[PDB]
Design an enzyme around this catalytic site. Structure first.
Site, PDB file in Angstrom:
ATOM      1  N   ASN A 193      -7.747   9.435  -5.327  1.00 40.16           N
ATOM      2  CA  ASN A 193      -8.602   8.523  -6.075  1.00 40.16           C
ATOM      3  C   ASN A 193      -9.463   9.288  -7.080  1.00 40.16           C
ATOM      4  OD1 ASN A 193      -8.955   7.072  -2.884  1.00 40.16           O
ATOM      5  ND2 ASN A 193      -7.732   6.188  -4.542  1.00 40.16           N
ATOM      6  N   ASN A 217      -8.830   5.480   3.413  1.00 36.26           N
ATOM      7  CA  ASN A 217      -9.503   6.339   2.453  1.00 36.26           C
ATOM      8  C   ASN A 217     -10.429   7.346   3.128  1.00 36.26           C
ATOM      9  OD1 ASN A 217     -12.099   6.556   0.448  1.00 36.26           O
ATOM     10  ND2 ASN A 217     -10.139   6.731  -0.580  1.00 36.26           N
ATOM     11  N   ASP A 270      -6.276   8.511  -0.202  1.00 35.46           N
ATOM     12  CA  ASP A 270      -5.791   7.482   0.716  1.00 35.46           C
ATOM     13  C   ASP A 270      -4.585   8.007   1.479  1.00 35.46           C
ATOM     14  OD1 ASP A 270      -7.657   5.745  -0.370  1.00 35.46           O
ATOM     15  OD2 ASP A 270      -6.213   4.842  -1.745  1.00 35.46           O
ATOM     16  N   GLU A 299       0.825  -1.208   0.000  1.00 31.84           N
ATOM     17  CA  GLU A 299       0.000   0.000   0.000  1.00 31.84           C
ATOM     18  C   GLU A 299       0.859   1.257   0.000  1.00 31.84           C
ATOM     19  OE1 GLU A 299      -3.081   0.497  -0.420  1.00 31.84           O
ATOM     20  OE2 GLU A 299      -3.903  -1.536  -0.250  1.00 31.84           O
ATOM     21  N   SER A 349     -11.664  11.304  -3.384  1.00 36.88           N
ATOM     22  CA  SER A 349     -11.141  10.941  -2.084  1.00 36.88           C
ATOM     23  C   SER A 349      -9.631  10.727  -2.170  1.00 36.88           C
ATOM     24  CB  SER A 349     -11.842   9.692  -1.567  1.00 36.88           C
ATOM     25  OG  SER A 349     -11.543   8.596  -2.411  1.00 36.88           O
ATOM     26  N   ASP A 388     -12.573   9.312  -7.554  1.00 38.37           N
ATOM     27  CA  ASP A 388     -13.768   9.940  -7.008  1.00 38.37           C
ATOM     28  C   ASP A 388     -13.464  11.190  -6.187  1.00 38.37           C
ATOM     29  OD1 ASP A 388     -12.668   8.849  -4.716  1.00 38.37           O
ATOM     30  OD2 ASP A 388     -14.440   7.723  -4.120  1.00 38.37           O
TER      31      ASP A 388
END
EC number: 3.2.1.17
Length: 129
Positions: free
Chosen positions: A46, A59, A52, A35, A50, A48
């Site tokens: 991301n 998220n 991380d 990750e 958002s 959308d």
């Protein structure tokens, strides 16, 4: 902070992640490696909108507040920046709630695609634990 492999394993163990909801330590270390490459300051945006955050790439759509994900949730009740600390306590405490929500560690795409079904104990081998 960029953790070493065994250093992170030991920190994770101290915070109660070994066998948490049945996931052995190597699962958590493997997920953190893919990750974030063990980097607590990792961020990724991301599609959308958002973002991380942190060593487990938690998220902002559901888990933390970063002030720029409209209509999102803050289920861990923390600012997302807290997830970037060299102290992994906030990331671990939030991860425990994510992994308990019904989908286990499948909430981490890199775990599902790169750790699930592999020899995850290899990630803690050689470590003094």
């Amino acid at each position: 902070k960029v953790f070493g492999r065994c250093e992170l394993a030991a920190a994770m163990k101290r915070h109660g992640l070994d066998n948490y909801r049945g996931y052995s330590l190597g699962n958590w270390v493997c997920a953190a490696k893919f990750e974030s490459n063990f980097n607590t300051q990792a961020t990724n945006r991301n599609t959308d909108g958002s973002t991380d955050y942190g060593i487990l790439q938690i998220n902002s759509r559901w888990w933390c507040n970063d002030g720029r994900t409209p209509g999102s949730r803050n289920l861990c009740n923390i600012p997302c920046s807290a997830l970037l600390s060299s102290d992994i306590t906030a990331s671990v405490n939030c991860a425990k709630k994510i992994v308990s929500d019904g989908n286990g560690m499948n909430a981490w795409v890199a775990w599902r695609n790169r750790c699930k079904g592999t020899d995850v104990q290899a990630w803690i081998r050689g470590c003094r634990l």
